Write a protein that binds this DNA or RNA. Structure first.
Lengths: 799, 793
DNA sequence: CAACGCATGAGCTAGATCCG
DNA sequence: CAACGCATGAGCTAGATCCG
């Protein structure tokens, strides 16, 4: 048979030898086998227990900290292959920290699928270099066998097999003193083999019974099916654990087995691509009866079944497990008994939920003010009810002033009853709005939600406020609204002006951020206005804002204020929030204008957009200047030590880019470059200060050397005079002429003619010239460097 | 008379010319006089206004943005001198931003006391450089007269007095075209002077009527008394504002006027050293009857009289008003309607209050913790009562759990009634302690303080928890305590562990109130252990803490936990806090190794204490070894282009002297604790140093002799420095002839080694001077003697 | 009679219908 | 029968009376 035994789930063994007895009949093991951490175990109870039927290993096998073993071959006589379906601690097979292990005994290993072997901290093992991992491990670059007994060549290493020469040495490879590592001809690399060199069927491995048969060898490569295995079985069966394929009726049962939330190590197995895979990946969702994965058109809920049917949420961790959940098949209860700052984290943890079936209850919430973090809520089933058929419950909460924004929020209630008691910080009109937007309209308990204990302490207002005039400037805004007086003008404390900038318009209403939290609405107060007893007067109260960032939208509103007393009147008034943007002004300076020269007429400059554009800048303004040379260098004796070597004004309206190149200019000339970032131009033309950089273009190759008639005049005193022409456009400037002469058989003797010397003499001279035939050559050395040499002018002076 | 007119309080004028009429009769003005910002003013309304009877100015006079004036002389004819007791904006006089001022006109001004004068932004002013400020200003450097009409010399400057030569020029000094600056002989500097050069009485200034009379000149220097004045007034009177003396009968009346606290311009004047001073300074305190200031033995209360009897505090600002107050003569009510973090600021704001007279009311307090910020309260007088003769009021505070630690807190109550209603988190035993420590014992109302609305929600515990075994390490601490069970050992949720370090033992107790505090007792939870049903078992639950720094005292206690229910049992139990210190470990590396050479042998070392002490370091340990230099420079031609130690103890600096001179040393130091048991010492810090490159040993002294060959190539023989500054690398050998300079040569290390000297090829016959200098790698040394040798032609 | 002038514009002198 | 041995000490294998 290929596999006549039984499947065998991965076990864990520790502190005893009692629970290894379950290995009596299983032959192939799925998962991993792990035995570890046993101390009070004598070595003698090991010579009687064994398991001959074990061959296949899926993930890994590990033994660690064992006291009593000396050669495990008596325990594992027949295992041959490990699939390595899950790598263990980036390793495939490891033995570590052994005490009595005399020898390994793993003589049946044929081919390691994936991963590496590691042997460490074992001072009792030998024959470690006689394994030939390369013939079993397809990868050797990951092996790690250091600090063992074979650290010193001291353990024998004698064994009676081909003794391969894989390295530069004739090395003998044996497992034990009674066994070597079997190697047959390599005509087939991993197609299985026999002891006579005959390769068995192509699609199986290792030990074999009859060649060229996929029905009677031991282990085959791809899959397995009832004594046979083909590379891809037909779709009466669907692949499983990448070593089998089976009918859907088998693994439809496993999904049902632990659909009961009893053991969280399983998987609700799903069919996809002929695989009964644990989970179909993202962008795919489960179907009800077909057990396939639907392409998940758009976002798909990833339903999140609640345990126990009910749950309470009190801290970050209590809700952290709900992150990503969208639909709840139970009931939820919230109670933040105190807490510092959770309003900034609920959206990051639960602000993506939409559907729930149970009932929602809020109680004893201390620092809660709104329900905005419940973002995508639309419907509650209310399938289960609180005692008294209550679907929504609110009780004993001392800061709740709002629930939702019905201008852009929708919520539906299937059934149940609401409970609003001891909630003194929320007005009755808001819960009337709750009822109107909800499904219930007249389902009142009588006594229904409390109408007297809720909102009594909070003076909910019913009066609006409107502006009178708005003013704009670059930094300062002015406000002044229509004046107000309470029924008792004596009873009045003034107004508060809450504000903050906003790049959008999805700004929250006053959420009453009173406990710990993020940036609230920074605010100043205003003195109450002076009574005038006049219909027409300056009773319109205003206030100034000064420190503003220009060109920025800003949202503001004003709120009244009054004392608290026995009478339930003078609730004050509240304006409405609007949006107003500030004006723009001069922009900031551009950033890092980088100019680079490549050719003698090409100069490119690139910069960065200004840090503060202050509105949509229209274009960039550019300017340059052709710099001049140093006039003081004209009068330097350069043959003395010390020489130098360097490296309106028209404009354009450069638009819609970040760099510009300029051509048609002088060669090897310095240039001062300035550029202004600038906002909208034709009205109030205002630009920033120009960023100033300097740049010099490349020189011209021929500009340094001069060609022309080099004539000579001979004087009576053997002082020959020399006439020639200077470069018209030197690279920067000519600084010296490398004048020199050569008689035949004599080296290049060079003299100097400085700039001023050449200017005054219109040439040079050679005092004290020996009679002979001399060749005079000149190199026009400009400041850009040495030029080329002239023609060596021949002239012979006789005795 | 001397000062026949009237005293005249400092006055402020704006928006009109109306409020100047109050100065009809006053001649001497105290304080300052500010007139500014009038625009709807014709220039013609000033020619008919004057005050000819003004003499004295205390602080300063300021003209600012006046429209219509052109010459102040029509208004101020007799101003002479100013005391300048307070410098306005660090100046004595400033006229600024005038529009029509044509000529200045201050001609009667004689002497300034202190400060300087500044004129700015006035393009209508002339004769400005014709003043001679130095003869009125005792200081001139800080003058600032810039950007005026005299920015350009264009306004004429014709003017009819000496025209002094104070500068390098004969400059005329004159005020107007009708009057010039008046200067008399300086036989007396400012002792009063007439127009005939007759100096008046020594103790007066300015203009004067008859010479040498302390009774009929105009203004005097120090003080004033009834038409006379002496430099030190007799003590029937007390000096006031450093320009008069007067008896206490006057300034006590002003003290009694201000004790009616109606204006905030007060200075509650007290008598001290014949000066009825505003306030006798720190280290002093006034006495009631005698009006003197008591030496203030110890911290004296500086009583803070509360206004309008009562006050409420809700934010940081309302409390900052009473910062620095200790005794309050009223009643206070506190309502913290929320807030974020306030417990850490009440100490810094009001932690100096100890006594209160009225009553205390607390209501609607939300985010409170305790009243520990009331550090030193010991008595309430209760001289004002709440309705129903109530003195202490606590109501509708849904968070309060503790008031004071009465083991170390002393507090008594004089009279009144206490109130406790609707405070569901504070147990009644604390109120029992309040009653027992307070003055009252049974003064109850019936209904008195509510016994059901308070502490019902929070289960106050009545059981203690005791530790069983403690083990400590350098890094970790293990704890395990006695077993415990509720009457129903099902209802239970485990325990909490609150711990934190504390360098002292004045640690705040856990309070159970929600403070939005940056620091709180970091706490972990514990899983309740296994029920064993056996009295002798492993039921003792424990826990390990490991993330701790060595050698640090740590506070710890454990708290029970159980679900809330309807039955009023299973309150739990609470351990008492204790203190435990972790063990010590190896120290850290020392810091800042500094070595300096002050001789060729002395090497002074200085270091810094290490960052991590890990306990009191018992001593140090320093090791030094003999190190040296390299040898790759030996072949480079330079004409081209155990180790001894000592247990240093209880000091921060060290010197290694009495050792071989000019030797390189690598020295290392370690600091650590006790040695013979558990020999623990940290790592060392290495230093590298050289003694100073010497000045005489690098140079070599010896006979620089020469051997003459027949080919005019004279050999040179001398000796190398036996101990040079490291390694001699180049000898600055040179030869100098008569009429010739010190012509030089060079020799490398190997050349001198192979030749045992040098030579000179192609030498002119003459008396040469051969001088050599040692130029090693560390620098040049001294020259040898210039040797004389006279080879003939 | 509906911005600017006869200031400055947030550095011990007021604080943008604050002025007419 | 009251620290150590037949581990390590917070890097997918337990979590310091955790094993005796």
């Amino acid at each position: 048979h290929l596999y006549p035994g039984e499947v065998c789930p991965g076990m864990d063994i520790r502190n005893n030898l009692t629970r290894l007895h379950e290995l009596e009949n299983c032959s192939v093991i799925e998962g991993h086998l792990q035995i570890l951490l046993m101390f009070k175990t004598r070595p003698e109870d090991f010579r009687d227990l064994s398991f001959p039927k074990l061959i296949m290993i899926t993930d890994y096998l590990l033994l660690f900290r064992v006291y009593g073993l000396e050669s495990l071959k008596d325990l594992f006589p027949n295992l041959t292959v490990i699939r390595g379906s899950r790598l263990f601690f980036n390793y495939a097979l490891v033995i570590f920290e052994m005490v009595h292990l005399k020898e390994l005994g793993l003589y049946n290993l044929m081919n390691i699928t994936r991963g590496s072997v590691r042997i460490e901290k074992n001072n009792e093992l030998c024959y470690l270099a006689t394994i030939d991992w390369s013939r079993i491990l397809d990868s050797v670059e990951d092996n790690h066998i250091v600090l063992n007994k074979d650290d010193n060549e001291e353990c024998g290493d004698i064994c009676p097999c081909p003794a391969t020469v894989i390295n530069g040495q004739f090395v003998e490879r044996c497992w034990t003193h009674s066994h070597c590592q079997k190697v047959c001809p390599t005509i087939c690399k991993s197609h299985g083999c026999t002891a006579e060199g005959l390769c068995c069927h192509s699609e199986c491995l290792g030990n074999c019974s009859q060649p060229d048969d996929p029905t009677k060898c031991v282990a085959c490569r791809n899959f397995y099916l009832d004594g046979r295995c083909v590379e891809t079985c037909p779709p009466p069966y669907y692949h499983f654990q990448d070593w089998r394929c089976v009918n859907f009726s088998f693994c439809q049962d496993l999904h049902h087995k632990c659909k009961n939330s009893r053991r969280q190590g399983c998987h609700q197995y799903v069919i996809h691509n002929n695989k009964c895979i644990p989970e179909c990946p993202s962008g795919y969702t489960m179907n009800s009866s077909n057990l396939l994965c639907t392409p998940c058109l758009g976002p798909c809920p990833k339903v999140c079944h609640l345990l126990e049917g009910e749950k309470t949420i009190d801290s970050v961790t209590s809700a952290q497990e709900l992150r990503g959940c969208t639909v709840i098949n139970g009931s939820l209860i919230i109670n933040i008994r105190g807490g510092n700052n959770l309003a900034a984290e609920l959206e990051a943890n639960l602000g993506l939920i939409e559907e729930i079936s149970g009932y929602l209850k809020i109680r004893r919430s201390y620092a809660l003010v709104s329900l905005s973090f419940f973002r995508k809520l639309r419907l509650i089933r209310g399938e289960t009810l609180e005692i008294g058929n209550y679907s929504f419950y609110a009780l004993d909460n001392q800061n709740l002033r709002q629930l939702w924004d019905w201008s852009k929020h929708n919520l539906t209630t299937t059934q149940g009853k609401l409970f609003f008691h001891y909630n003194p910080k929320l007005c009755l009109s808001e819960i009337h709005k709750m009822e109107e937007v909800s499904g219930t309209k007249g389902r009142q308990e009588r006594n229904d939600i409390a109408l007297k204990t809720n909102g009594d302490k909070a003076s909910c207002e019913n009066e609006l406020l409107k502006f009178s005039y708005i003013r704009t400037s670059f930094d300062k805004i002015l406000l002044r609204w229509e004046p107000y007086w309470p029924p008792d003008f004596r009873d009045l404390l003034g107004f508060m002006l809450f504000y903050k900038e906003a790049p959008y318009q999805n700004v929250t209403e006053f959420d009453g951020q009173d406990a710990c939290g993020s940036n609230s609405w920074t605010v100043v107060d205003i003195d109450p206005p002076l009574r005038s007893n006049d219909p027409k007067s300056q009773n319109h109260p205003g206030w100034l804002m000064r420190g503003l960032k220009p060109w920025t939208q800003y949202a503001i509103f004003v709120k009244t204020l009054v004392t608290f007393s026995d009478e339930r009147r003078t609730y004050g008034a509240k304006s409405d929030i609007i949006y107003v943007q500030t004006d723009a002004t001069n922009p900031s300076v551009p950033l890092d204008p980088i100019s680079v020269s490549n050719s003698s007429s090409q100069i490119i400059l690139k910069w960065k957009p200004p840090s503060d554009p202050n509105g949509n800048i229209t274009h960039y303004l550019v300017f340059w200047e052709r710099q001049a040379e140093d006039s003081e260098l004209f009068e330097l004796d350069y043959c003395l030590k010390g020489l130098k070597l360097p490296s309106h004004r028209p404009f354009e309206k450069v638009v819609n880019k970040e760099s510009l190149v300029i051509s048609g200019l002088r060669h090897f000339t310095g240039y001062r470059i300035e550029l202004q970032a600038c906002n909208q131009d034709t009205p109030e033309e205002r630009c920033s200060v120009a960023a100033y950089v300097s740049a010099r273009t490349m020189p011209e190759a021929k500009a340094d050397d001069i060609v022309g008639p080099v004539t000579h005049e001979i004087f009576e005193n053997n002082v020959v005079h020399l006439m020639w022409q200077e470069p018209k456009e030197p690279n920067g400037l000519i600084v010296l002429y490398e004048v020199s002469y050569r008689r035949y058989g004599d080296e290049e003797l060079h003299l100097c003619v400085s700039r001023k010397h050449f200017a005054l003499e219109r040439g040079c001279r050679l005092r004290g010239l020996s009679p002979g035939n001399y060749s005079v050559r000149i190199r026009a050395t400009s400041l850009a460097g040495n030029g080329s040499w002239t023609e060596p002018t021949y002239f012979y002076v006789t005795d």
